[PDB]
Design a protein around this ligand. Structure first.
Ligand SMILES: [Mg+2]
Ligand SMILES: [Mg+2]
Ligand SMILES: [Mg+2]
Ligand SMILES: [Mg+2]
Lengths: 240, 240, 236, 236
């Protein structure tokens, strides 16, 4: 039978390592979307949940003129990229995307879009379901920098779920990186980028570039190839 | 009108940054479980999907004697902790848990369990839905080391979803840490640990301890307080 | 010329900006280490403590003599007038030949990085103490990789490379500070993560701060005071 | 006796193990830096190259004289017999006073960490070149934080702290290597991540390896050969 409270090295007690502040904020999490992932938690900014693109704007200025219908929105390649009105630093993000069942094209010209983190660093979106391409630029790559850990594609018609955790960089006075950005990317529950260091801007041509910036929007890419446009749904973001 | 392929610094072409190996493995992802998260992808080890605990054993040796029923398994506190037969290093993990609707108790004595990563580092499981406790030991904490970024609890009866990404430590010859373990923890889609460094063993009493180890099992905690036992479902793990 | 994958040439990976600044390095001090490079702030090179102040306000009243300065325990801690974030630092210190005392009460001083995080200074030449608080420790957090002490009378050389933390809006750490410490050419802290304030009692504390001075510790035990020389700092 | 949160006492955060090993540090070399501490492997201190071998197999046939050794470009690279993982390293090098050449063809050598990752050696005293390949660069990957050259005839001092990578089963990096480089007391690489092999042509390559030697480069341009002294390494 026990007769006294146990103590540790030099008499330390369990209470001495029990703290009551800072209190983590209470968040009511979202629910599961059929064929998708989590909907927005109570402290998240809802960027899209089926109604409109009022949280977005054209990169050319003015309203975001992608097509909203049936609880999704669809890229209009004649209108170009759209971006969040709001700018971000560290964040967690959710976004779901669908390659249409009538998709055509090969390699980089088949359902190409992308999520530009702070407007600088592309997380590639592409139909890589039975579509080979260069591996450092396939789905879930940090475009042309970091090869994804897997190909976790769902087929056209189904929804590919991204969960993204992003840490923004800091810059020195002279414009060079003080700390690089880092990103974790999970696609359909599969980790594709595991705390990957971002080397600089994602570039189609040449080495990544070091360009000082502060907070930036999320930019969704209108890739001007002729492939049928992809659709998006259930986009939310919460600042970390 | 275009008349030549664009080039970058010193004539670099887009092809010179396009690589076709190493090819990421093709994984068929799982589906969404109603009220939960993702089921196991094709390359994952299924630790539980409703049938039995054949992937587990008692920490005392022999069969894992927690109670399997209705597609879940329920802690039997008289039997003690259970652990995976298999040992792991770096991994991604999924696990869902339910506080029963008739739960009773306060603070650390209310639906207390936990996931010991490699058998050494507890990710706390606890009913913190309207139940205050010490914040460095509440739900999703790295127990008594790292306070979770939020309280993202679902109420009793509903399923709390964990997605965990873990990097194992390396040890020096003298037994000290060469690299510390790191962990990301997401609960119901909300990030609770963002690439958190683990300082050593999780301890109820005293400072974290530095104890050299290699690969270790996942241990699920039977916390011997009188509260009604929690239930688990949809457990899978994939090695990174 | 030879070419690589898809015809890439050696010129395509040769960049001419940004140009690293030209620094004239210092020289070697006999019995010590490097003197200040041309872009460094000279905190002490034998003349005076004009770069320092008392933590109580006013002049730094430690005793300058013979090209060194010596702790005056009756006056308390001194600190740099200037505040710093990321930096590289050099500092040399001498335990006097007539030193007395044991454990933490034998030539105890310290370098508080941004005023918050102590790199321990102590005479650990044939003087055991608690290992997480011995010379070159991040005090009571990180045990040094070695004991690289020179004996009393000789000069112990610190080279320190420090990365400042960032803080979240709620006051918690966004990124922790990191520090490398080299004593007499031997690495004692290898890119060590600092957990919070260094504390004699209790767990490290998380206290939001910006730029901070370098504070040199006057530890009020009765041991004979240590002396300092060749202190410089350059911002990173 | 003062106490902290929930009555915690100062003794409860005072640990007496693990005890850091006692190391007798080296001394200061005139015009250079620290000589080898007692636990360091002495790779060169003036006598011979018995710790080295030709990369082609057999004896290292660079020329030992006057307490230094000098590159013989007809013989090619030399490397340590011993292989290393994590380490701290010291190495001093001299551009001869009669040096000639421009850009990469002027006193070019280098230290290949584990045989894979070049820390550039070059005479960049009034000699411009591409900045990502100048002195103290991680060759063509990471531009050094400064140009801290001493002139020809004088000794440039490197202190290097290196963490080896780990590799996944499929041959990709699990953890990248990191390196700190200090030249003549000035930090040139501050815990820099190495991206892969250093390459004259193309992107850095990911090639699985274990422990590797230190390789010193014989760069086959016609410039007068550089000399080395005071090389030591200690495992971390
Ligand atoms: Mg794209
Ligand atoms: Mg528990
Ligand atoms: Mg002290
Ligand atoms: Mg070279």
């Amino acid at each position: 039978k026990e007769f006294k409270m146990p103590t540790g090295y030099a008499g330390i007690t369990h209470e001495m390592s029990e703290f009551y502040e800072p209190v983590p904020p209470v968040v009511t999490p979202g629910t599961d979307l059929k064929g998708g992932g989590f909907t927005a938690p109570s402290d998240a900014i809802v960027l899209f949940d089926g109604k409109d693109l009022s949280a977005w704007e054209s990169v050319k200025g003015g309203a975001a003129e992608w097509d909203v219908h049936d609880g999704v929105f669809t890229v209009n390649k004649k209108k170009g990229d759209i971006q969040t009105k709001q700018k971000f630093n560290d964040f967690q993000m959710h976004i779901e995307w669908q390659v249409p069942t009538n998709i055509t094209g090969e390699s980089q010209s088949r359902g190409n879009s992308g999520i530009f983190l702070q407007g600088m660093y592309e997380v590639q979106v592409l139909d890589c379901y039975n579509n080979p391409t260069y591996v450092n630029g396939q789905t879930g790559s940090i475009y042309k920098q970091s090869i994804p850990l897997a190909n976790a594609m769902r087929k056209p018609g189904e929804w590919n779920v991204y969960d993204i955790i992003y840490t923004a960089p800091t810059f020195k006075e002279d414009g060079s990186y003080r700390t690089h950005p880092t990103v974790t990317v999970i696609q359909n529950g599969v980790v594709l980028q595991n705390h990957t260091t971002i080397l600089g801007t994602t570039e189609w041509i040449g080495f990544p570039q070091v360009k000082k910036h502060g907070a930036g929007p999320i930019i969704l890419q209108s890739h001007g190839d002729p492939s049928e446009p992809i659709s998006f749904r259930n986009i939310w973001i919460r600042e970390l």
